[PDB]
């Protein structure tokens, strides 16, 4: 380790410490729960309408709407965690405030789906800070148009989880996503790109130290960033459909804000 490398390690450690502060349920905690290598009670499993209702002891809309709205509420909380984490990224708060807003607006769902993968396996997803586990088959079964809204996320997650990143890798990756110079409408790209270049150097060093076995993990990881955007644009289209067919539904105001003029 030389001096520029050492600056890269300090950045990596700084981001990891903020990540743990900001995000209550880490991938490490999530993994223990899912394998059962944990000292906690195993989570309550929701595989049908009845288990969902019995689990609600651990409004009265139709179940598909309850579930979709539960997903919204989790994003609302995630946006808050991600915003706090973003503020800890060196140089982020010194950017033009409109640009900070634009980066968050475009970055949050990409981060949400990245981190949701930490909570997933091929059979289901942890919910409510790991107190629950909701089965993938149950989610597929919801009535249209809610029946397939999770499948692109599960599919992304099985591929992404094959990379076996840990929380220290993810902390940096998430920051790289937030500092994307190509977001529509940015006012001053150069200072964002300068920060992203350091973050990317830090990610690459991190991947080489923590995964010396896995050659070109860095390159594989960067290609996932393009897959994430597609998850998001497809999701926007499903929401357009949902808004048209269910006037029962109302979108949380934070989410309206984020989604407005997004793609």
């Amino acid at each position: 380790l030389n001096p520029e490398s050492a600056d890269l390690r300090a950045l990596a450690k700084h981001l990891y410490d903020s990540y743990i502060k900001s995000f209550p349920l880490t991938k490490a905690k999530a993994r223990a729960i899912l394998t059962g290598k944990t000292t906690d009670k195993s989570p309550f499993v929701i595989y049908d309408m009845n288990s969902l209702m019995m689990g609600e002891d651990k409004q009265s809309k139709e179940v598909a709407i309850r579930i979709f709205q539960g997903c919204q509420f989790r994003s609302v909380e995630a946006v808050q965690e991600i915003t706090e984490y973003a503020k800890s990224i060196p140089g982020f708060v010194n950017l033009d405030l409109n640009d900070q807003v634009t980066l968050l607006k475009y970055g949050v769902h990409e981060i949400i789906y990245t981190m949701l993968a930490s909570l997933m396996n091929k059979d289901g997803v942890l919910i409510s800070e790991g107190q629950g586990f909701m089965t993938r088959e149950f989610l597929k079964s919801l009535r249209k148009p809610f029946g397939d809204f999770m499948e692109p996320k599960f599919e992304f997650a099985v591929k992404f989880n094959a990379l076996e990143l840990d929380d220290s890798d993810l902390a940096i990756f998430i920051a790289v996503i937030i500092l994307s110079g190509d977001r529509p409408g940015l006012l001053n790209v150069k200072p964002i790109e300068d920060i992203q270049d350091n973050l990317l150097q830090a990610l690459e060093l991190q991947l080489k130290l923590n995964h010396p076995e896995s050659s070109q993990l860095f390159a594989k990881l960067l290609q996932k960033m393009t897959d994430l955007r597609q998850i998001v644009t497809e999701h926007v289209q499903l929401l357009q459909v949902i808004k048209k067919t269910e006037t029962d539904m109302s979108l949380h105001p934070l989410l309206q804000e984020i989604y407005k003029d997004l793609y």
Binding site: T83, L97, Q100, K105, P253, L254, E257, I258, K260
Partner: peptide, 11 residues
Amino acid sequence: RHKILHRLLQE
């Protein structure tokens, strides 16, 4: 626009 996001950022 992005009133909540400003607020969360400026918080």
